[PDB]
Structure formats: C-alpha cells, structure tokens
Amino acid sequence: EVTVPDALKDRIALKKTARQLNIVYFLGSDTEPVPDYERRLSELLLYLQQFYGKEMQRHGYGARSFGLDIKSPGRVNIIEYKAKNPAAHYPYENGGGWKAAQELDEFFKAHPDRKKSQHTLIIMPTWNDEKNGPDNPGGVPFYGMGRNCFALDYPAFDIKHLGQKTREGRLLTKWYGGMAHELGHGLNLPHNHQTASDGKKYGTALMGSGNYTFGTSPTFLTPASCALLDACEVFSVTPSQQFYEGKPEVEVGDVAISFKGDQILVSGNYKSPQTVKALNVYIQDPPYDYDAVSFSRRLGKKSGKFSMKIDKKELEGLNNNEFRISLMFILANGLHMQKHFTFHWDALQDYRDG
Ligand SMILES: [Zn+2]
C-alpha cells in the first residue's frame, strides 16, 4: 500500500500541464533494476516537482511545476527501457549519453504514445565494479544534454535520507542535489549566482556552479531561472502553445547601458513576431566559465521598451576588473536570444548602439 513520506506531507496542488517530462529507467542488456525503484524514484521526483513548483509560486507564477505522468497516487509512470547493448556501451565518457539518447529517439519513434514532451530524464543504475558501487555510485551519464538529463540510481537513493547527517544523507545531497541541478539544465537553465540580497534570505541558487546544496542547505531558484521555466515546454498550461520550433527572432534596438554611482542602467526596445515573455540580465566575470549574477524583468508583449536598474552591491562573488553584461530575451515558445557587452570597472564607459 502507498504511504506518503514525511517530506511530502507538505505539498501544494499543482496546475495540470499540457506536456510532461518523460521519465525513463534505462537498463543495459546485462543490468538489473535497483530494487524498489518505482517507489523510491517516484518519491524523489515528486519532491523535486514540489521544489520547482513552490519556487515558481513564490515568484508569482502560481502553482506551476514540470509535468509528470502519474500512474497512481504517489507513483510516477516511469518507462522501463531495456537497452540493446550492455551497460558498458553507455558510459559517462566517450558519448555514452548521446548513444543512449539516440536509442531512446528510436524507441519513441516506434512508440510515440509514450512520449509526452521533448524533455526526458534518463536514470541508469550505478555500475558495480572496482570503482563504483552502492557506496560510491557512478559509471553512467550524469549531466544535462540538450532537452534531456541523465541521472543515476543506487540502493540508498531514497528520500528517507534527506538532510540526515549520515553517510547515506551525504550521498543523497550529492546525487539528488546533482539530479536537481542537472534536471535544471535539461529544463533549459544555465548557471547563475544568487544576488547578495537573495543569498542572505534564501541561500544558494540551485543553478550555481558550486557544489550541490539541494536537501542540505537552503536552496532556491532565482527570478531569472523561473523566467526561463515559465517558457519551458513541460511547465506549459496552454495546449495551443508550441515549443522550440523555428528560430528566436528578436530585434533589439537603441540599447543603452550606463553607469551612475553604484547603479547600472540598462534600456532599449524590442520587437518579435512572438510574445517576448521576459528579459534576463546576466553579469559575469571572465573567462568567456564562472557563475554570472542574474536579474529578470517581465515583458509580456511582442514589442515595447525595456528598462532595468541594477545595484552594483548586489553583484556578490564577482571580483574581476573585466565584466560582461548579457541581455537575454525569452520567447513564448521557449527559445531565446542574447546580446553581450563587455566593460572594465577601472575604465567604465557608457554604451550606446551606433
Ligand atoms: Zn551545471
């Protein structure tokens, strides 16, 4: 019988989505499933869905998370896929993830009813050899890759260890926190660093480039991350909206970036055949990669003006004389385009388009 783990007693009802993240449990031809994976992974995926949804709600989007196909209460409809080759054919290195994704493309072409969006989370059991095992999982792809994400499973991959000061709890923050961040990449998120103010109130940005924090110390999603998720296919509540087709078409004009005291003033105009959902601004140190501090403003029109004032004291962690400001325009179909501008703190020069 299904029971709800204590970590899921506090949970919000989520909006029904038009597209769902596919969950594939990917087994080499010689690979057995890790026991109880249906329960363990359902619990972990539903808790992760709550994290994303509560953060979207906190940022004003309502109770919107990535969609999941639910088989029964507390149980995600996980596709168990038995692969054509042994697990050694799909390693972390040397294109293992690409080979697995290609094979799943064929599976979904043969069984299109099982595909619910362009986004897939592929989970593979750990290898068990002289390097990896239940106490040191690994061997398998573990990264975002395009719209897909690869993560791993092992016996103690179980929400009951969340936040426990134990060997298994530490393992969970590494591999579940890892899954949370890598899934972010699969959901179109780049890296970004919290602002000074957000760091003090909410902790560490999920998509920061440092060590995984999820489940161990306060972790949150930035406004810029949530603006991208707003335009992510598996967060859609609008069946008529198509995602990722074509090219990102945004005309940006009369761009001006000026510096006055501790304020950075960014302005210009935009025009697109699509609704432009939002502007994200990233301020980043070289090399051109360390985490950029991000900011976001809603737009919501096909044409208009944009204006953002950024306080330099929010730029926590930046320490280079050279810095780059990137303007990212996010479109309703989930594509985006960026423009970049480079400056030096010891020789600040206001920018204006020619
Ligand atoms: Zn990353």
Numbering used by the authors: 25 to 312, 317 to 382
Q: Which passages does the manuscript contain on this structure?
A:
Here we focus on OgpA from A. muciniphila, a recently discovered O-glycopeptidase that exclusively hydrolyzes the peptide bond N-terminal to serine or threonine residues substituted with an O-glycan. OgpAWT comprises two domains from the N- to the C-terminus: (i) a catalytic domain (residues 25–262) followed by (ii) a β-sandwich domain (residues 263-385). Interestingly, a Zn2+ atom coordinates with the side chains of three histidine residues, H205, H209, and H215, a highly conserved triad among metalloproteases. A glutamate residue, E206, is well-positioned to act as a general base/acid during catalysis.
The crystal structure of full-length OgpA in its unliganded form was solved using zinc single-wavelength anomalous dispersion (Zn-SAD). The high quality of the electron density maps allowed the trace of residues 27–380 (OgpAWT1) and 25 to 382 (OgpAWT2). The overall protein scaffold and the conformation of the OgpAWT1 and OgpAWT2 were essentially preserved (root mean square deviation, r.m.s.d., of 0.37 Å for 350 residues). However, the connecting loop α4–α5 (loop 9; residues 227–246) is unstructured in OgpAWT2 whereas in OgpAWT1 displays a short α-helix. Furthermore, we were unable to fully model the β7–β8 connecting loop (loop 12; residues 309–320) on OgpAWT2 crystal structure because it is disordered. A close inspection of the two crystal structures revealed that the protein crystallized as a monomer. The first β-sheet of the antiparallel β-sandwich domain consists of four β-strands with topology β6–β7–β8–β11, whereas the second β-sheet comprises four β-strands with topology β13–β12–β9–β10, with an overall size of 39 × 28 × 19 Å (“Methods” section). Both domains are separated by a long and open groove that runs parallel to the protein surface where the active site is located.
